[PDB]
Design an enzyme around this catalytic site. Structure first.
Site, PDB file in Angstrom:
ATOM      1  CG  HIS A 183     -57.348  50.471  69.198  1.00 13.60           C
ATOM      2  ND1 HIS A 183     -56.284  49.597  69.324  1.00 13.60           N
ATOM      3  CD2 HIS A 183     -58.405  49.856  69.782  1.00 13.60           C
ATOM      4  CE1 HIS A 183     -56.682  48.508  69.949  1.00 13.60           C
ATOM      5  NE2 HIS A 183     -57.969  48.638  70.240  1.00 13.60           N
TER       6      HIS A 183
ATOM      7  CD  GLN B 235     -57.920  52.199  75.914  1.00 10.70           C
ATOM      8  OE1 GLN B 235     -58.196  53.022  75.034  1.00 10.70           O
ATOM      9  NE2 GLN B 235     -58.479  50.994  75.967  1.00 10.70           N
TER      10      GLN B 235
HETATM   11 FE    FE Z   1     -59.222  46.856  70.616  1.00 13.62          FE
HETATM   12 MG    MG Z   2     -61.768  48.427  72.483  1.00  9.50          MG
END
Ligand code: FE
Ligand code: MG
Ligand code: FE
Ligand code: MG
Lengths: 423, 423
Positions: free
Chosen positions: B211, B153
């Site tokens: 992502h 992330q």
């Molecule tokens: Fe996601």
């Molecule tokens: Mg998200």
């Protein structure tokens, strides 16, 4: 007959409440300090939310339920929708309009909707759909208060005898005068059509609801004339500008200037999320605009705005079950009203704000008002919206006119477990 | 045990079908010339639609169910979501992650979802959520095949020990390697992070799900590197580019050039309609872009694209009941896939296309496959979508693992009438 609604939660209020009923009206509303026992003549809201009826401020009951007849709109475009509708001409009769309108009205009753404003195309010398809808209005009265808008779909000045037909519709009983300035041949016809619309509304003492600037044209500003004329006549409360999707494309400076007038005028605004996201932005490639009017800014400015379904199962909008929580769900997402409070207060967009738009005089959970209310099996607006709950009970005149036994879901793990989608 | 599924409708097929089951697998599929009688060991689809299980190709089970804890995100913005999540730090434990993940997983089981790909934040030296999710994967296995994506992330190169932690997650068992190039400090780190991601996927023989370009930046083109590296390694089927919302803002010429590569590469694409419409376009004033990737064009070009829910009841997406038909409904509207056939074929976006994205080897109603299937009380995909029907029955390994008794709605007119929202 029902004498009380108990264990009710009310939007914006803490705790539980008891709503006393008498002679088809709300006699009193008292707070409870705990859960009340059920009993004969008491409808238990079971700590669910009680609100005045859902409202449909903008729908077309004359075209509803025709999708796929005789053929389906495969492209999903406005253009093909017109062609598909034209292919059903032979089936458009008095009885056909009544049958389809009633089908959608039944879905609305099932969905706790007790107030509906339907537009009806009056760009038809025979006024077939209008005559049918006037009968439907009388027939459905025990369950829904239906308002009919004389909607000159092909224009007032741009269609043969358009103005005469619009007035004829009012003489026959239409409740609201409609218009569609952006569809007139010229900007001048657009502005003039609004003067004629307002003159008719004042002549017959009717409301006004204009299909206003429903186009991705930054130069379509008929809304300023609607608001100015309303302000001049001191009749803002009786006036509504539907769609105003062009506002999504205005520059910010003009919009700021315009907003002062919108607020001062007191007119109402209807956004139709399901249809707007579908039909707007069709001339863009990428990026593609959303095309919904400035709902968030209107709310922040105290301008009355609400949501309509617009079309149900027809050539222009193939989907729908006439469900207002579904309309609200789409609007909150596209308008980015996704903060907790914004979502929770969302119910206002399909209840109180819409009642104001219809200029309703008997609406709201208050002593003296008719006992018209619905019960949602949810804790608050946020919960009702998130779980897309059905209407557990719809009460009109103190009598239950609709009820839904909720679905029951079970998952079979090591042991069976009931799932209600709550944490 | 169940031996047959009778009176089943199948997407793209005419008539009714019988699905024979044996030893937890589909033994044969035969057409019926009419309605078959029910009997012991037969599950009656009652002319409803039978399809392989719904799939959730993109969700974050490590953050699910935390909305409002300890405070609610009032603005609804990404920025505030980060702050609200940070306030719950003290509650983020092994047991907490397992409890919340299981709550959403139960909603998914109830919603006929038997395949789920969850991303898990691995930009945490303690890898707390990952260790918890690995246990959840084993625990939920009888009902859901859960894939875990090691999602860095905070970036691979832009976070301390990011690459080491990403690899540690794979050594612990993560099924998929994640990345987030547009969040890296520089474009160069973004491109380099993808080379590292692909190297790890080949080293451990794992899938990839990036992502990718989740930003309204017309210059965010990491998707071309994802596709090029996949093509170079001949591993398109194992690669997925999630989001690619930047593609909504690309000029058409570059997009056309890019599409040739996307098709040749064979990689998968995931769009997350509910979250994309909410989080994208936030830096625009008016008009405001939709921000969803080019789903319609991908379908027209034969590029595999599907829909994910992304977030459920958390600081970044406050809504949801983990319902794929709801995700599909939003996607069809925002992507303007509103033609009859486009809507009807919509089920592919939450079934077959998603199965391909997860590289599933045992999926589909076909002889030889495991008896994993669900029954929707609807005539076809269009009907299921329009009425947002629940999953009547979910069958896994030839056994019922979930069932929903539909809601029952009645309107009280001159006589009581059942309403099913069908015409
Ligand atoms: Fe996601
Ligand atoms: Mg998200
Ligand atoms: Fe309309
Ligand atoms: Mg319209």
């Amino acid at each position: 007959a029902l004498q009380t609604i108990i264990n009710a939660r009310l939007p914006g209020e803490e705790g539980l409440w008891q709503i006393h009923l008498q002679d088809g009206k709300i006699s009193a509303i008292d707070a409870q300090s705990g859960v009340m026992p059920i009993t004969e003549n008491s409808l238990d809201a079971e700590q669910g939310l009680v609100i005045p009826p859902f409202v449909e401020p903008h729908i077309h009951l004359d075209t509803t339920q025709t999708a796929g007849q005789p053929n389906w709109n495969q492209s999903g475009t406005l253009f093909e929708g017109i062609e598909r509708w034209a292919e059903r001409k032979a089936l458009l009769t008095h009885d056909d309009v009544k049958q389809r309108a009633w089908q959608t009205l039944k879905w609305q009753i099932a969905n706790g909707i007790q107030h509906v404003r339907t537009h009806v195309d009056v760009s038809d010398a025979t006024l077939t759909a209008l005559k049918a809808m006037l009968e439907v209005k009388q027939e459905v009265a025990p369950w829904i208060d239906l308002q009919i808008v004389a909607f000159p779909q092909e224009g007032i000045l741009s269609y043969p005898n358009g103005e005469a037909l619009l007035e004829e519709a009012l003489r026959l009983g239409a409740d609201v005068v409609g218009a569609i300035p952006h569809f007139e041949f010229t900007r001048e016809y657009g502005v003039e059509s609004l003067h004629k619309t307002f003159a008719l509304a004042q002549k017959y003492d009717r409301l006004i609801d204009v299909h206003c600037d429903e186009i991705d044209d930054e130069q379509s500003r008929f809304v300023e004339t609607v608001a100015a004329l309303a302000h001049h006549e001191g009749m803002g409360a009786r006036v509504t500008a539907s769609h105003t999707t062009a506002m999504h494309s205005y520059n910010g400076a003009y919009t700021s200037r315009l907003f002062r007038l919108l607020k001062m005028s007191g007119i109402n605004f209807v956004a139709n999320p399901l249809v707007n996201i579908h039909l707007q932005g069709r001339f863009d490639t990428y990026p593609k605009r959303r095309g919904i009017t400035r709902v968030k800014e209107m709310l922040e400015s105290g301008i009355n705005v609400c949501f309509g379904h617009d079309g149900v199962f027809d050539p222009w909008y193939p989907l729908g079950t006439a469900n207002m929580l579904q309309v609200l769900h789409m609007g909150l997402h596209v308008c980015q009203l996704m903060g907790y409070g914004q979502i929770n207060d969302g119910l206002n967009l399909i209840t109180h704000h819409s009642a104001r738009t219809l200029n309703l005089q008997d609406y709201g959970i208050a002593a003296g008002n008719s006992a018209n209310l619905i019960i949602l099996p949810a804790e608050n607006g946020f919960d009702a919206l998130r779980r897309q709950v059905p209407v557990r009970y719809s009460v009109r005149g103190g009598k239950v006119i609709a009820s839904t036994q909720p679905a029951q879901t079970t998952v079979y793990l090591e042991q069976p477990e009931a799932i209600d989608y709550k944490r």
